[PDB]
Design an enzyme around this catalytic site. Structure first.
Site, PDB file in Angstrom:
ATOM      1  N   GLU A   1     -73.902  -2.953 -56.204  1.00  0.00           N
ATOM      2  CA  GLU A   1     -74.543  -3.592 -55.047  1.00  0.00           C
ATOM      3  C   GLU A   1     -73.644  -3.506 -53.815  1.00  0.00           C
ATOM      4  OE1 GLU A   1     -74.846  -7.840 -54.625  1.00  0.00           O
ATOM      5  OE2 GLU A   1     -76.840  -7.706 -53.771  1.00  0.00           O
TER       6      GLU A   1
ATOM      7  N   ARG B   1     -75.081 -19.586 -46.216  1.00  0.00           N
ATOM      8  CA  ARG B   1     -76.057 -20.577 -45.792  1.00  0.00           C
ATOM      9  C   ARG B   1     -76.920 -21.088 -46.930  1.00  0.00           C
ATOM     10  NH1 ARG B   1     -81.521 -19.323 -46.588  1.00  0.00           N
ATOM     11  NH2 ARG B   1     -81.662 -17.079 -46.987  1.00  0.00           N
TER      12      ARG B   1
ATOM     13  N   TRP C   1     -82.503  -6.500 -57.325  1.00  0.00           N
ATOM     14  CA  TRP C   1     -83.305  -6.501 -56.108  1.00  0.00           C
ATOM     15  C   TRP C   1     -84.762  -6.098 -56.282  1.00  0.00           C
ATOM     16  CZ3 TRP C   1     -82.402  -8.433 -51.373  1.00  0.00           C
ATOM     17  CH2 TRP C   1     -81.081  -8.776 -51.046  1.00  0.00           C
TER      18      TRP C   1
ATOM     19  N   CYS D   1     -78.487 -14.527 -47.522  1.00  0.00           N
ATOM     20  CA  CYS D   1     -77.889 -15.738 -48.064  1.00  0.00           C
ATOM     21  C   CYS D   1     -76.395 -15.797 -47.730  1.00  0.00           C
ATOM     22  CB  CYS D   1     -78.051 -15.849 -49.586  1.00  0.00           C
ATOM     23  SG  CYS D   1     -79.764 -16.157 -50.084  1.00  0.00           S
TER      24      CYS D   1
ATOM     25  N   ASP E   1     -77.427 -20.222 -54.648  1.00  0.00           N
ATOM     26  CA  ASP E   1     -77.896 -20.520 -56.006  1.00  0.00           C
ATOM     27  C   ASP E   1     -76.608 -20.559 -56.834  1.00  0.00           C
ATOM     28  OD1 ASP E   1     -78.627 -20.108 -58.782  1.00  0.00           O
ATOM     29  OD2 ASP E   1     -80.209 -18.682 -58.181  1.00  0.00           O
TER      30      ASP E   1
ATOM     31  N   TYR F   1     -78.917  -6.993 -45.576  1.00  0.00           N
ATOM     32  CA  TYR F   1     -77.482  -6.805 -45.576  1.00  0.00           C
ATOM     33  C   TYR F   1     -76.964  -5.459 -45.108  1.00  0.00           C
ATOM     34  CZ  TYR F   1     -77.621 -10.981 -48.554  1.00  0.00           C
ATOM     35  OH  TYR F   1     -77.833 -12.246 -49.059  1.00  0.00           O
TER      36      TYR F   1
HETATM   37  O1  LIG Z   1     -75.743  -8.437 -63.520  1.00  0.00           O
HETATM   38  C1  LIG Z   1     -76.960  -8.147 -63.471  1.00  0.00           C
HETATM   39  O2  LIG Z   1     -77.360  -6.987 -63.719  1.00  0.00           O
HETATM   40  C2  LIG Z   1     -77.984  -9.218 -63.093  1.00  0.00           C
HETATM   41  C3  LIG Z   1     -77.979 -10.470 -63.967  1.00  0.00           C
HETATM   42  C4  LIG Z   1     -78.413 -11.822 -63.382  1.00  0.00           C
HETATM   43  N1  LIG Z   1     -78.280 -12.012 -61.921  1.00  0.00           N
HETATM   44  C5  LIG Z   1     -79.183 -12.394 -61.002  1.00  0.00           C
HETATM   45  O3  LIG Z   1     -80.376 -12.595 -61.261  1.00  0.00           O
HETATM   46  C6  LIG Z   1     -78.741 -12.445 -59.538  1.00  0.00           C
HETATM   47  C7  LIG Z   1     -77.483 -12.026 -59.052  1.00  0.00           C
HETATM   48  C8  LIG Z   1     -77.180 -12.085 -57.691  1.00  0.00           C
HETATM   49  C9  LIG Z   1     -78.131 -12.585 -56.826  1.00  0.00           C
HETATM   50  S1  LIG Z   1     -77.860 -12.685 -55.075  1.00  0.00           S
HETATM   51  O4  LIG Z   1     -77.958 -14.191 -54.607  1.00  0.00           O
HETATM   52  O5  LIG Z   1     -76.481 -12.019 -54.757  1.00  0.00           O
HETATM   53  N2  LIG Z   1     -79.160 -11.765 -54.406  1.00  0.00           N
HETATM   54  C10 LIG Z   1     -79.185 -10.313 -54.402  1.00  0.00           C
HETATM   55  C11 LIG Z   1     -80.691 -10.118 -54.730  1.00  0.00           C
HETATM   56  C12 LIG Z   1     -81.347 -11.186 -53.842  1.00  0.00           C
HETATM   57  C13 LIG Z   1     -80.405 -12.409 -53.994  1.00  0.00           C
HETATM   58  C14 LIG Z   1     -80.454 -13.434 -52.861  1.00  0.00           C
HETATM   59  O6  LIG Z   1     -79.710 -13.602 -51.885  1.00  0.00           O
HETATM   60  O7  LIG Z   1     -81.402 -14.285 -52.957  1.00  0.00           O
HETATM   61  C15 LIG Z   1     -79.388 -12.994 -57.255  1.00  0.00           C
HETATM   62  C16 LIG Z   1     -79.683 -12.925 -58.610  1.00  0.00           C
HETATM   63  C17 LIG Z   1     -77.458 -12.910 -63.998  1.00  0.00           C
HETATM   64  O8  LIG Z   1     -77.806 -13.598 -64.976  1.00  0.00           O
HETATM   65  O9  LIG Z   1     -76.323 -13.018 -63.467  1.00  0.00           O
END
Ligand SMILES: O=C(O)CC[C@H](NC(=O)c1ccc(S(=O)(=O)N2CCC[C@@H]2C(=O)O)cc1)C(=O)O
Ligand SMILES: O=C(O)CC[C@H](NC(=O)c1ccc(S(=O)(=O)N2CCC[C@@H]2C(=O)O)cc1)C(=O)O
Lengths: 261, 262
Positions: A58, A166, A80, A146, A169, A94
């Site tokens: 990413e 801002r 994503w 985020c 999760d 981003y």
């Molecule tokens: O590592 C992997 O392949 C994914 C496994 C899984 N991770 C997630 O769903 C996960 C990880 C990062 C994020 S993030 O906050 O950086 N992010 C990137 C996608 C959109 C979201 C946002 O800002 O809302 C959002 C979700 C987990 O259980 O950690």
């Protein structure tokens, strides 16, 4: 990680019940700060196995200025997928703001190139910043940023970075976000011949979703382990030339991964 | 104030000796956070006399979207004078970005109005934000925003606000910046029928200028007095319709002013 586990506990103890835009609840707090001295170890949560592979792809994707998930697809990173349209597009999220923030006259600003030039030529600058918060482009994004604003700082040959997040999760996003910026600091420090300093994390709306509470309870019953050490195996020509295989994490000894809906 | 003096003491104990852009040395730390529960009292520094007069005029000026010093100069507020060009213009600083951020497609976004509407209609929104950090116009500004990015939050009928200050002049700037945003929280809370919550201050490059060190230690030898109180006497029809005379501070009994060189 100690700070990470105290943050989780604080949301549980002090968070107020809220209803987000999806109708799912969250317990949230407003305003929090943590500091990670990167010379003490790479800040990858050990209370659940985190997969660095997706964090690494990413960040590289971000640095290329790509906002289409194809490259993430080619490498089996699916975080994503749900925001992407039928063509795999996310809008100017981003990456596009980091590398090509559009100005009104049709020009584009490359904040990463600016930052590297500031670090090399004016390290004491008080404005070594990257903002993903492009107000005029928010409506075009699949998601407003985020992890939205970050700043670099140099003292005694060490490179620190502070992120203003801002919206956080705590269970699912945070582990990823901390590792991502720690990773970027190591890469910038290497390209600029600097040592690594601190990763300062500042949160705005900091929350735990209601369907992450079993997982949160499970994670808090575990004891953190000594942090791993990040190894960069090859020093590329520039900050835009890293590849997945350049990074290795050594001494990573996490508790088992914890799945969340 | 206790939080403010503790930050002064932190910069002195941990700061790294560096050199500002003009050479004038600085002692600086990176990363800091403090909080002011606004129901405890209005956070106007008491360890030196501060004039709220200038802070109020600057905030009304910001809120109008004005970037010329005429209004400030007319009201004997000279804090922006050294940055103005021969016609009094500062470029598209703070106030212009707050009220009319220019988008790529030729629209302008009024971020204050946006926030006001998000507080009235979707107070749990996680993107109740105002950004002065317009990357595309920073180099047209006389100065890049110091108090650069801020966010609002609502819980239990109280309005809170967090400011990210990328560069902070602790002795001279900070007292003004804290009172400024605390006043803005009061005004917004009044406009959306909310109570005041906390003002959260976060610093990036947080420094004490080398020629403010004796003034800083003089201030550190004093005891903070009880916080003053803020009385707003009217409820204007909009957040842009406040007047100077609508604000009164009560119970402000500070130690003597301390002059220092900008
Ligand atoms: O590592 C992997 O392949 C994914 C496994 C899984 N991770 C997630 O769903 C996960 C990880 C990062 C994020 S993030 O906050 O950086 N992010 C990137 C996608 C959109 C979201 C946002 O800002 O809302 C959002 C979700 C987990 O259980 O950690
Ligand atoms: O009352 C007066 O005319 C001001 C006297 C004096 N205050 C300051 O110099 C002062 C007040 C505010 C500031 S500021 O950081 O908010 N700010 C506003 C002017 C440009 C400057 C900046 O971004 O660099 C910077 C300095 C003080 O002792 O508080």
């Amino acid at each position: 990680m100690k700070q990470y586990l105290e943050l989780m506990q604080k949301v549980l103890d002090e968070g107020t019940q809220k209803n987000d835009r999806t109708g799912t609840g969250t317990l949230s707090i407003f305003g929090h700060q943590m500091r990670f001295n990167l010379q003490d170890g790479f800040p990858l949560v050990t209370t659940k196995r985190c997969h660095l592979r997706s964090i690494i792809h990413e960040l590289l994707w971000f640095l290329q200025g790509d906002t289409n998930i194809a490259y993430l697809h080619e490498n089996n990173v699916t975080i994503w997928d749900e925001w992407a349209d039928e063509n795999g597009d996310l809008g100017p999220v981003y990456g596009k703001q980091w590398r090509a923030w559009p100005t009104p006259d049709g020009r584009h600003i490359d904040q990463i190139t600016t930052v590297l030039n500031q670090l090399k030529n004016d390290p004491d600058s008080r404005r070594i910043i990257v903002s993903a918060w492009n107000v005029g482009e928010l409506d075009k994004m699949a998601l407003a940023p985020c992890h939205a604003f970050f700043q670099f700082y140099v003292a005694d040959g060490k490179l620190s970075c502070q992120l203003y997040q801002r919206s956080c999760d705590v269970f699912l996003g945070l582990p990823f976000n901390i590792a991502s910026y720690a990773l970027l600091v190591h890469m910038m420090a290497q390209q600029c011949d600097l040592e690594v300093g601190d990763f300062v994390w500042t949160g705005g709306d900091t929350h735990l979703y209601s369907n992450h509470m079993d997982q949160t309870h499970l994670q808090l019953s575990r004891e953190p382990r000594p942090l791993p050490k990040l190894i960069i195996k090859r020093k590329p020509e520039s900050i835009f030339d890293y590849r997945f295989e350049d990074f290795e994490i050594e001494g990573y000894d996490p508790h088992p991964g914890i799945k969340a809906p």
